[PDB]
Every structure is written in structure tokens, then in C-alpha cells.
Amino acid sequence: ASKRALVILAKGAEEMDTVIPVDVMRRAGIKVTVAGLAGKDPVQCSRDVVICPDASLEDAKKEGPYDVVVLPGGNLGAQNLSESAAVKEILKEQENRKGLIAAICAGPTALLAHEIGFGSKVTTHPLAKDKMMNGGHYTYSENRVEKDGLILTSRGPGTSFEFALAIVEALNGKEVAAQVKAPLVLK
Amino acid sequence: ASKRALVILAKGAEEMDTVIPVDVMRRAGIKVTVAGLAGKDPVQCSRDVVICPDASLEDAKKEGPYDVVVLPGGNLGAQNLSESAAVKEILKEQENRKGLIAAICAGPTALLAHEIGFGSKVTTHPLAKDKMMNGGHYTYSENRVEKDGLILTSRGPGTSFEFALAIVEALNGKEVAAQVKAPLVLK
């Protein structure tokens, strides 16, 4: 049985925050669906890399549930995730079934928007801290990767390998994470 | 005047090796053209991320010269780069005009194929060393980023931020590289 990941890709997403987890999860043997928030059409990311999703979110949501739901960052991408009723329902359903939710950089601010995981320790990009902390619903961390039960968060493009490997460890174990890590040539 | 980069994107390219330099160079104010080797159509990368190029290589080559030519890795992507007469002519012209050439992971093996930069110190992914060193035309290094004049090389996805920032330093200087680096949240 392979584990399955849903990566929700919106216009303005940070392309590094998107691609590094997709690639590293696929190296781990996870079945990853890159789902376009707005449909199946190509998505223009924050630094103008254009990525073609595997499916629309409308279609991918009918194929779950997923062992992890991943929210990339990019301020405008996270804003789009935060405004979507479909994303709200996916995350609420994932939380209710005790499934992992992973978000990086500005991505965790969509958790706030959707009232997901309140009372958890979280990290974000430093510039997203004030947005995430509005109302005091989370406890903040400066760790590069933070995991408080089912809520897994991380800080930025430069923490995206660590983030992705933490997802891999959570789903497929420490040994698979270590095996996937070595050929990456990480610090 | 902004500096310009040509990133040559072939089927089977490593998507992390591709996207991290494109994004980081754009953060540095470099004008980056992601050029599809085979045409303008979307490119299926090694871990199945599909990237839409900005232009075909046929068109982008008519718009140079470029201040850097970047060759991503991925074994099958590097093989495609190595087999292309267009890539041979671009790299030969770049070498002749004393322009920077940057290649990561398996990417440097296309330099060997095209007889570019012989006599330079280079690095590659560890698994690409034997291919790169066939004939002894380069001197090998285990540094995470190696630069020997105009030939700039690096090892893997996990060295791609360092690689990209070395390109930025070469084109736009140390201060711009440091400014771009800080918001990335690197180790």
C-alpha cells in the first residue's frame, strides 16, 4: 500500500515550496497529486515558473482521502488557499480524520483562515508570523520544521528539503527518509 | 541594464535543479528565459513535475547572447542536452565570448559531451563523477559549488540554493547575493 499526498497549487504559489516537496515525496514512493485550485490549467507561480497540475482540485478531492495535505507558500498563493471553500472543506475533513496537514512559509496562514489546528505550535516564514499569530490561536516557533501532532509546518524555500523529509518520515518512516536524503547532497 | 540567463529545459530534467536557480535568479533581478530544448510545449521533468517553458530553445537562441547559460541535471535531461547540436552551438559560442556557463548535478556531463571547458576544476553529483571524468579532461572536486573561471558547477538538489547564489554573485555581486539569500531561510 502506498501513501498518498495532495499538494494544492494556486496562482502565486512559491514554486520552490511546491516542487521540492512534490519531488522528494515521489522519491519516497508517495503517490502525489498536484491539484490545481482553480482547475486543470497551468498555474503561474510567484516567480513566473508555470506548472501544469496533475488534476483539478475539484477532481482530486473526489479521490481522497489523502495521508497528507500539503499547502505551499507564496503570499498570493496562500491568500488564494485561504479564500477557497474547497480548501476549507478538505482541511476540515483531514483534521477530523486525524490526517497529517503540512504547510510551509506563508502556507500556514491558510490554516488560520480555515480555523485548522488551533492550539498547535507552528512556524512560518518570519514575514508571515504576524498574520499567523493574529488572535493568538497558535504558539509560535522558530524551528526550521515544527510538528505538533498532525500539524507540520516550516519556514521558507531554504527549509523545504527538511520539510519534505519530515513529511516522508511521518508517512514512510525514518529509514526511508534517510535513504531519500542521501542522494540529495544536503548540507 | 539587467543581466540575462538562459536555462535550457529538456525532458527528464531534475525539476528542483531547474526551479531553484530560475526562482533565485529572478529574485536577484536577472531576466531568465526558461527555454524548452524540444520546443515550446510543456516539459515532463524527472519526478513528473510538468513545466511550461517561456520559449523554445530555437527562439531563445536568436535572442542572445546571455550572461549565463544554465544546464540543470537529471540524468535523462542531461543526456538530452548532450545529444543536441543546438546546445553544442550555444555553449561553444558562450565559451568563445567568455560568458559564464553553469551546470548542476548530472548537468556538467553535457559540458563533456560538447567538449566545453576542458582543463577546468568541476564537481558533479557523486553518481555522475565517472561519466564526467571519462578521459580525464577535467579535474574533480567535492566542493558543493566549484567555479573555475567561467565554468561553474555544483552537486545536487541539496546544493542548488548555493549554486544559484553563486550565479547571482557572479552576475550581480556579493551584496545582491546576500540580500537575496536572507529571505530564503537557508541553514
From Swiss-Prot, chains A, B:
Changing C45A: Reduces protein stability. No effect on oxidation. The record marks D148, G149 as: Cleavage. The modification N6-acetyllysine is found at K147. InterPro entries: Class_I_gatase-like, DJ-1, DJ-1/PfpI, Prot/Nucl_acid_deglycase. Changing L165P: In PARK7; strongly decreases enzymatic activity; reduces protein stability and leads to increased degradation; ubiquitinated by PRKN leading to its recognition by HDAC6 and targeting to aggresome where is degraded; interferes with homodimerization; abolishes interaction with PIAS2; reduced localization in lipid rafts; almost abolished detoxification activity on methylglyocal-adducted CoA. Highly expressed in pancreas, kidney, skeletal muscle, liver, testis and heart. Detected at slightly lower levels in placenta and brain (at protein level). Detected in astrocytes, Sertoli cells, spermatogonia, spermatids and spermatozoa. Expressed by pancreatic islets at higher levels than surrounding exocrine tissues. It catalyses: N(omega)-(1-hydroxy-2-oxopropyl)-L-arginyl-[protein] + H2O = lactate + L-arginyl-[protein] + H(+); N(6)-(1-hydroxy-2-oxopropyl)-L-lysyl-[protein] + H2O = lactate + L-lysyl-[protein] + H(+); S-(1-hydroxy-2-oxopropyl)-L-cysteinyl-[protein] + H2O = lactate + L-cysteinyl-[protein] + H(+); N(omega)-(1-hydroxy-2-oxoethyl)-L-arginyl-[protein] + H2O = L-arginyl-[protein] + glycolate + H(+). It comes from Homo sapiens. This is Parkinson disease protein 7. It is a lipid-anchor. It is linked to Parkinson disease 7: A neurodegenerative disorder characterized by resting tremor, postural tremor, bradykinesia, muscular rigidity, anxiety and psychotic episodes. PARK7 has onset before 40 years, slow progression and initial good response to levodopa. Some patients may show traits reminiscent of amyotrophic lateral sclerosis-parkinsonism/dementia complex (Guam disease). GO terms for cellular component: adherens junction; axon; cell body; chromatin; cytoplasm; cytosol; endoplasmic reticulum; extracellular exosome. The modification Phosphotyrosine is found at Y66. Changing C105S: Loss of protein and nucleic acid deglycase activity. No effect on mitochondrial translocation. Reduced protease activity. No effect on protection against metal cytotoxicity. No effect on methylglyoxal-adducted glutathione or CoA. GO terms for molecular function: cadherin binding; copper ion binding; cupric ion binding; cuprous ion binding; cytokine binding; DNA-binding transcription factor binding; enzyme activator activity; enzyme binding. PANTHER family: PARKINSON DISEASE PROTEIN 7 HOMOLOG, PROTEIN/NUCLEIC ACID DEGLYCASE DJ-1-RELATED. Induction: By hydrogen peroxide and UV irradiation. In pancreatic islets, expression increases under hyperglycemic conditions. Expression is also induced by sulforaphane, an isothiocyanate obtained from cruciferous vegetables. The keyword Protease applies. The gene is PARK7. Its main location: membrane. Changing L9P: Abolishes detoxification activity on methylglyocal-adducted CoA.
